[PDB]
Design a protein around this ligand. Structure first.
Ligand SMILES: O=C(O)c1ccc(Cl)cc1
Length: 126
């Protein structure tokens, strides 16, 4: 159901957290080769999560689930903010700008955490 599809989306989000934290570690340690591979992994995760999120949103819409639609619209907007910062980070990595990479790493953390207390409102609304 929409709810099993949400637990699958939540698990991909958790896969991103795990990989992001091992990417941050590699960045701090200077292992650019690893960072490069982690950024590719995280790109695919974002893409996969965004597709699971769109299917959940469209499903909630077809189901007339107004509250779920409101919360999903708010969550995906925030999700997109994190994606846009991620893309800026990838660009900082290609350009050799470590000052910006570190900054984006931090802002992407704060934007992802903020979107968490809502993630547990969607779950109960679907
Ligand atoms: O899909 C997510 O939740 C997600 C994906 C990628 C990053 Cl870097 C951070 C969060």
């Amino acid at each position: 159901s929409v709810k099993s599809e949400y637990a699958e989306a939540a698990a991909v989000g958790q896969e991103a957290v795990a990989v992001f934290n091992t990417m941050k570690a590699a960045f701090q340690n200077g292992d650019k080769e690893a960072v490069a591979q982690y950024l590719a992994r995280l790109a695919s995760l974002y893409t996969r999560h965004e597709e699971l999120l769109n299917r959940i949103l469209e499903k909630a819409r077809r189901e007339g689930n107004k509250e779920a639609v409101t919360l999903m619209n708010e969550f995906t907007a925030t999700f997109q903010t994190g994606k846009s910062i991620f893309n800026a980070m990838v660009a900082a990595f290609k350009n050799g700008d470590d000052d910006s990479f570190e900054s984006y790493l931090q802002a992407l953390e704060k934007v992802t955490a903020k979107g968490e207390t809502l993630a547990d409102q969607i779950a109960k609304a679907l």
